[PDB]
Amino acid sequence: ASRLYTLVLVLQPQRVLLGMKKRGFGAGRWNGFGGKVQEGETIEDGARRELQEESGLTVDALHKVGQIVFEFVGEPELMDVHVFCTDSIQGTPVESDEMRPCWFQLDQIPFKDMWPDDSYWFPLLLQKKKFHGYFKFQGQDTILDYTLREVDTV
Ligand SMILES: CNc1cc(N2CCN(C3COC3)CC2)nc(N)n1
């Protein structure tokens, strides 16, 4: 049993957009934009919805780039995160109640202030490789097990 989540990375030739999560799960960490997928919407619809809610941005096309499954010790539901990237965005990002957006140069990604798993799979995203990952967490800071592979179909 798993629950569906989205994650959107706006990746342009020299920069990537991240948001500082201001409240809730993962507050205090930079991340892409996203959240739970709702009943009645497709995964990609939910990714666009969360991007708009969290940054005001809309997008022409979202591309599937990864899937990451998370186990949190003691939590019954696996988190199934579908990761999307886009290069063309519509609008200028603006702060929301959940997210403070900032562009980062591709050699200045703030890994120490991101989810620890990003350090493993974010390079593959920047290298335009598609990937499947699995990370088992104890709490929010400690990776106990993980797998990571490149795939041809996300
Ligand atoms: C547990 N490791 C994670 C999890 C994660 N997501 C889970 C939570 N999710 C939504 C819950 O509100 C945002 C955002 C993506 N993103 C990243 N980069 N790493």
PDB file of C-alpha atoms and ligand atoms in Angstrom:
ATOM      1  CA  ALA A   1       0.000   0.000   0.000  1.00  0.00           C
ATOM      2  CA  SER A   2       1.367   3.369  -1.082  1.00  0.00           C
ATOM      3  CA  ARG A   3       0.185   6.960  -1.313  1.00  0.00           C
ATOM      4  CA  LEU A   4       0.794   9.084  -4.404  1.00  0.00           C
ATOM      5  CA  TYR A   5       2.812  12.308  -4.258  1.00  0.00           C
ATOM      6  CA  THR A   6       4.227  14.690  -6.852  1.00  0.00           C
ATOM      7  CA  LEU A   7       7.478  16.616  -7.088  1.00  0.00           C
ATOM      8  CA  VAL A   8       8.213  19.225  -9.771  1.00  0.00           C
ATOM      9  CA  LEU A   9      11.669  20.550 -10.679  1.00  0.00           C
ATOM     10  CA  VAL A  10      11.895  23.581 -12.968  1.00  0.00           C
ATOM     11  CA  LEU A  11      15.316  22.983 -14.525  1.00  0.00           C
ATOM     12  CA  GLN A  12      16.706  25.542 -16.950  1.00  0.00           C
ATOM     13  CA  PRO A  13      20.109  25.448 -18.700  1.00  0.00           C
ATOM     14  CA  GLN A  14      21.923  27.272 -15.884  1.00  0.00           C
ATOM     15  CA  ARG A  15      19.575  27.180 -12.900  1.00  0.00           C
ATOM     16  CA  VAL A  16      16.973  25.166 -10.988  1.00  0.00           C
ATOM     17  CA  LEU A  17      14.007  26.482  -9.014  1.00  0.00           C
ATOM     18  CA  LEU A  18      13.539  25.279  -5.431  1.00  0.00           C
ATOM     19  CA  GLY A  19      11.181  26.247  -2.621  1.00  0.00           C
ATOM     20  CA  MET A  20      11.888  26.541   1.083  1.00  0.00           C
ATOM     21  CA  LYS A  21       9.080  24.625   2.807  1.00  0.00           C
ATOM     22  CA  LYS A  22       7.650  26.922   5.458  1.00  0.00           C
ATOM     23  CA  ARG A  23       5.301  24.595   7.350  1.00  0.00           C
ATOM     24  CA  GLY A  24       4.310  20.971   7.662  1.00  0.00           C
ATOM     25  CA  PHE A  25       6.193  17.868   6.582  1.00  0.00           C
ATOM     26  CA  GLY A  26       9.749  18.713   5.557  1.00  0.00           C
ATOM     27  CA  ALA A  27       9.591  22.345   6.718  1.00  0.00           C
ATOM     28  CA  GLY A  28      13.035  23.894   6.758  1.00  0.00           C
ATOM     29  CA  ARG A  29      14.234  22.137   3.590  1.00  0.00           C
ATOM     30  CA  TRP A  30      14.495  23.309   0.005  1.00  0.00           C
ATOM     31  CA  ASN A  31      12.666  21.031  -2.413  1.00  0.00           C
ATOM     32  CA  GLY A  32      10.759  20.929  -5.661  1.00  0.00           C
ATOM     33  CA  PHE A  33       7.060  21.736  -5.636  1.00  0.00           C
ATOM     34  CA  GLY A  34       4.362  19.169  -4.988  1.00  0.00           C
ATOM     35  CA  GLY A  35       2.208  17.306  -2.530  1.00  0.00           C
ATOM     36  CA  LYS A  36      -0.416  14.608  -2.265  1.00  0.00           C
ATOM     37  CA  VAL A  37      -2.347  13.561  -5.363  1.00  0.00           C
ATOM     38  CA  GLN A  38      -6.071  13.974  -4.803  1.00  0.00           C
ATOM     39  CA  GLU A  39      -8.893  11.614  -5.613  1.00  0.00           C
ATOM     40  CA  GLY A  40     -10.327  12.710  -8.955  1.00  0.00           C
ATOM     41  CA  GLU A  41      -7.156  14.106 -10.544  1.00  0.00           C
ATOM     42  CA  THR A  42      -4.373  12.508 -12.537  1.00  0.00           C
ATOM     43  CA  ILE A  43      -0.849  12.474 -11.142  1.00  0.00           C
ATOM     44  CA  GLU A  44       0.240  15.123 -13.642  1.00  0.00           C
ATOM     45  CA  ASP A  45      -2.853  17.241 -12.877  1.00  0.00           C
ATOM     46  CA  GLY A  46      -1.935  17.136  -9.201  1.00  0.00           C
ATOM     47  CA  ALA A  47       1.652  18.106  -9.962  1.00  0.00           C
ATOM     48  CA  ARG A  48       0.478  21.140 -11.939  1.00  0.00           C
ATOM     49  CA  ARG A  49      -2.053  22.010  -9.233  1.00  0.00           C
ATOM     50  CA  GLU A  50       0.570  21.913  -6.488  1.00  0.00           C
ATOM     51  CA  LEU A  51       3.037  23.920  -8.566  1.00  0.00           C
ATOM     52  CA  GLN A  52       0.409  26.641  -9.074  1.00  0.00           C
ATOM     53  CA  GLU A  53      -0.698  26.578  -5.417  1.00  0.00           C
ATOM     54  CA  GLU A  54       2.867  26.771  -4.105  1.00  0.00           C
ATOM     55  CA  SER A  55       4.496  29.147  -6.602  1.00  0.00           C
ATOM     56  CA  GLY A  56       1.759  30.635  -8.814  1.00  0.00           C
ATOM     57  CA  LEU A  57       3.509  29.084 -11.818  1.00  0.00           C
ATOM     58  CA  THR A  58       1.862  27.251 -14.668  1.00  0.00           C
ATOM     59  CA  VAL A  59       3.631  25.055 -17.184  1.00  0.00           C
ATOM     60  CA  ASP A  60       3.130  24.044 -20.796  1.00  0.00           C
ATOM     61  CA  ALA A  61       4.545  20.509 -20.544  1.00  0.00           C
ATOM     62  CA  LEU A  62       5.699  18.350 -17.622  1.00  0.00           C
ATOM     63  CA  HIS A  63       8.092  15.464 -18.319  1.00  0.00           C
ATOM     64  CA  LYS A  64       8.308  12.325 -16.192  1.00  0.00           C
ATOM     65  CA  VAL A  65      11.866  11.976 -14.916  1.00  0.00           C
ATOM     66  CA  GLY A  66      11.706   9.726 -11.871  1.00  0.00           C
ATOM     67  CA  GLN A  67       9.902   7.681  -9.285  1.00  0.00           C
ATOM     68  CA  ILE A  68      11.037   7.455  -5.675  1.00  0.00           C
ATOM     69  CA  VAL A  69       9.455   5.151  -3.083  1.00  0.00           C
ATOM     70  CA  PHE A  70       9.966   5.928   0.613  1.00  0.00           C
ATOM     71  CA  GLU A  71       9.477   3.763   3.672  1.00  0.00           C
ATOM     72  CA  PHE A  72       9.368   5.529   7.017  1.00  0.00           C
ATOM     73  CA  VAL A  73       9.947   3.085   9.865  1.00  0.00           C
ATOM     74  CA  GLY A  74       6.734   2.568  11.824  1.00  0.00           C
ATOM     75  CA  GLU A  75       4.512   4.175   9.150  1.00  0.00           C
ATOM     76  CA  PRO A  76       2.339   1.671   7.246  1.00  0.00           C
ATOM     77  CA  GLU A  77       1.945   3.548   3.950  1.00  0.00           C
ATOM     78  CA  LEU A  78       4.806   3.816   1.498  1.00  0.00           C
ATOM     79  CA  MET A  79       5.216   7.250  -0.118  1.00  0.00           C
ATOM     80  CA  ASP A  80       5.268   6.963  -3.918  1.00  0.00           C
ATOM     81  CA  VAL A  81       6.715  10.226  -5.275  1.00  0.00           C
ATOM     82  CA  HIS A  82       6.423  10.847  -9.008  1.00  0.00           C
ATOM     83  CA  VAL A  83       9.104  13.328 -10.084  1.00  0.00           C
ATOM     84  CA  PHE A  84       8.596  15.717 -13.015  1.00  0.00           C
ATOM     85  CA  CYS A  85      10.795  18.294 -14.663  1.00  0.00           C
ATOM     86  CA  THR A  86      10.087  21.192 -16.965  1.00  0.00           C
ATOM     87  CA  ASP A  87      12.288  23.767 -18.626  1.00  0.00           C
ATOM     88  CA  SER A  88       9.616  26.248 -19.793  1.00  0.00           C
ATOM     89  CA  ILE A  89       7.544  27.918 -17.070  1.00  0.00           C
ATOM     90  CA  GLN A  90       4.778  30.486 -17.329  1.00  0.00           C
ATOM     91  CA  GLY A  91       5.018  33.400 -14.906  1.00  0.00           C
ATOM     92  CA  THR A  92       7.399  34.557 -12.217  1.00  0.00           C
ATOM     93  CA  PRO A  93       7.510  32.449  -9.034  1.00  0.00           C
ATOM     94  CA  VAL A  94       5.939  34.010  -5.966  1.00  0.00           C
ATOM     95  CA  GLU A  95       5.937  33.093  -2.313  1.00  0.00           C
ATOM     96  CA  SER A  96       3.012  31.075  -0.942  1.00  0.00           C
ATOM     97  CA  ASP A  97       2.047  30.049   2.593  1.00  0.00           C
ATOM     98  CA  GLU A  98       3.869  26.747   1.993  1.00  0.00           C
ATOM     99  CA  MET A  99       6.879  27.670  -0.136  1.00  0.00           C
ATOM    100  CA  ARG A 100       9.483  30.430  -0.566  1.00  0.00           C
ATOM    101  CA  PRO A 101      10.945  30.112  -4.111  1.00  0.00           C
ATOM    102  CA  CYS A 102      14.520  30.821  -5.135  1.00  0.00           C
ATOM    103  CA  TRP A 103      16.627  30.007  -8.205  1.00  0.00           C
ATOM    104  CA  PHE A 104      19.893  28.130  -7.580  1.00  0.00           C
ATOM    105  CA  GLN A 105      22.896  27.839  -9.847  1.00  0.00           C
ATOM    106  CA  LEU A 106      23.444  24.222 -10.808  1.00  0.00           C
ATOM    107  CA  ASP A 107      26.771  24.070  -8.948  1.00  0.00           C
ATOM    108  CA  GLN A 108      25.230  25.668  -5.816  1.00  0.00           C
ATOM    109  CA  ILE A 109      22.422  23.234  -4.996  1.00  0.00           C
ATOM    110  CA  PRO A 110      21.895  23.432  -1.163  1.00  0.00           C
ATOM    111  CA  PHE A 111      22.091  19.709  -0.480  1.00  0.00           C
ATOM    112  CA  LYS A 112      22.791  20.129   3.217  1.00  0.00           C
ATOM    113  CA  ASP A 113      19.394  21.869   3.535  1.00  0.00           C
ATOM    114  CA  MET A 114      17.450  19.384   1.369  1.00  0.00           C
ATOM    115  CA  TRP A 115      16.063  15.930   2.045  1.00  0.00           C
ATOM    116  CA  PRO A 116      19.096  13.605   2.396  1.00  0.00           C
ATOM    117  CA  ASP A 117      17.935  11.400  -0.466  1.00  0.00           C
ATOM    118  CA  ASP A 118      18.248  14.304  -2.918  1.00  0.00           C
ATOM    119  CA  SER A 119      22.046  14.048  -2.658  1.00  0.00           C
ATOM    120  CA  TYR A 120      21.751  10.622  -4.312  1.00  0.00           C
ATOM    121  CA  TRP A 121      19.194  11.168  -7.055  1.00  0.00           C
ATOM    122  CA  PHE A 122      19.347  14.895  -7.825  1.00  0.00           C
ATOM    123  CA  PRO A 123      22.594  14.445  -9.823  1.00  0.00           C
ATOM    124  CA  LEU A 124      20.784  11.961 -12.059  1.00  0.00           C
ATOM    125  CA  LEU A 125      18.048  14.541 -12.608  1.00  0.00           C
ATOM    126  CA  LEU A 126      20.607  17.215 -13.532  1.00  0.00           C
ATOM    127  CA  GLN A 127      22.276  14.721 -15.872  1.00  0.00           C
ATOM    128  CA  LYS A 128      18.905  14.229 -17.618  1.00  0.00           C
ATOM    129  CA  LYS A 129      18.780  10.527 -16.748  1.00  0.00           C
ATOM    130  CA  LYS A 130      15.505   8.876 -15.716  1.00  0.00           C
ATOM    131  CA  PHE A 131      15.595   6.952 -12.455  1.00  0.00           C
ATOM    132  CA  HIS A 132      13.821   4.732  -9.958  1.00  0.00           C
ATOM    133  CA  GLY A 133      14.792   5.130  -6.318  1.00  0.00           C
ATOM    134  CA  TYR A 134      13.850   3.581  -2.994  1.00  0.00           C
ATOM    135  CA  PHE A 135      14.810   5.047   0.376  1.00  0.00           C
ATOM    136  CA  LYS A 136      14.071   3.681   3.846  1.00  0.00           C
ATOM    137  CA  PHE A 137      14.108   6.393   6.528  1.00  0.00           C
ATOM    138  CA  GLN A 138      14.295   6.296  10.314  1.00  0.00           C
ATOM    139  CA  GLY A 139      12.752   9.645  11.142  1.00  0.00           C
ATOM    140  CA  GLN A 140      13.435  12.531   8.782  1.00  0.00           C
ATOM    141  CA  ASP A 141      17.268  12.527   8.798  1.00  0.00           C
ATOM    142  CA  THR A 142      18.606   8.962   8.569  1.00  0.00           C
ATOM    143  CA  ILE A 143      18.664   6.759   5.465  1.00  0.00           C
ATOM    144  CA  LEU A 144      18.858   3.098   6.560  1.00  0.00           C
ATOM    145  CA  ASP A 145      18.605   1.428   3.124  1.00  0.00           C
ATOM    146  CA  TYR A 146      18.333   2.651  -0.426  1.00  0.00           C
ATOM    147  CA  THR A 147      18.378   1.523  -4.043  1.00  0.00           C
ATOM    148  CA  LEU A 148      18.876   3.690  -7.112  1.00  0.00           C
ATOM    149  CA  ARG A 149      18.869   2.731 -10.788  1.00  0.00           C
ATOM    150  CA  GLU A 150      18.607   4.466 -14.153  1.00  0.00           C
ATOM    151  CA  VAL A 151      15.560   3.402 -16.188  1.00  0.00           C
ATOM    152  CA  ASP A 152      14.340   3.844 -19.744  1.00  0.00           C
ATOM    153  CA  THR A 153      10.673   4.145 -18.733  1.00  0.00           C
ATOM    154  CA  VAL A 154       9.716   6.027 -15.578  1.00  0.00           C
TER     155      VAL A 154
HETATM  156  C1  LIG B   1      11.580  11.557   2.132  1.00  0.00           C
HETATM  157  N1  LIG B   1      12.404  12.135   1.085  1.00  0.00           N
HETATM  158  C2  LIG B   1      11.849  13.104   0.174  1.00  0.00           C
HETATM  159  C3  LIG B   1      10.492  13.321   0.110  1.00  0.00           C
HETATM  160  C4  LIG B   1      10.041  14.282  -0.796  1.00  0.00           C
HETATM  161  N2  LIG B   1       8.588  14.558  -0.928  1.00  0.00           N
HETATM  162  C5  LIG B   1       7.627  14.141   0.098  1.00  0.00           C
HETATM  163  C6  LIG B   1       6.662  15.237   0.583  1.00  0.00           C
HETATM  164  N3  LIG B   1       6.154  15.919  -0.477  1.00  0.00           N
HETATM  165  C7  LIG B   1       5.084  16.648  -0.189  1.00  0.00           C
HETATM  166  C8  LIG B   1       4.459  16.615   1.119  1.00  0.00           C
HETATM  167  O1  LIG B   1       4.292  18.113   1.045  1.00  0.00           O
HETATM  168  C9  LIG B   1       5.250  18.139  -0.043  1.00  0.00           C
HETATM  169  C10 LIG B   1       7.136  16.584  -1.188  1.00  0.00           C
HETATM  170  C11 LIG B   1       8.066  15.568  -1.851  1.00  0.00           C
HETATM  171  N4  LIG B   1      10.901  14.959  -1.562  1.00  0.00           N
HETATM  172  C12 LIG B   1      12.179  14.712  -1.472  1.00  0.00           C
HETATM  173  N5  LIG B   1      13.090  15.440  -2.280  1.00  0.00           N
HETATM  174  N6  LIG B   1      12.663  13.806  -0.637  1.00  0.00           N
END
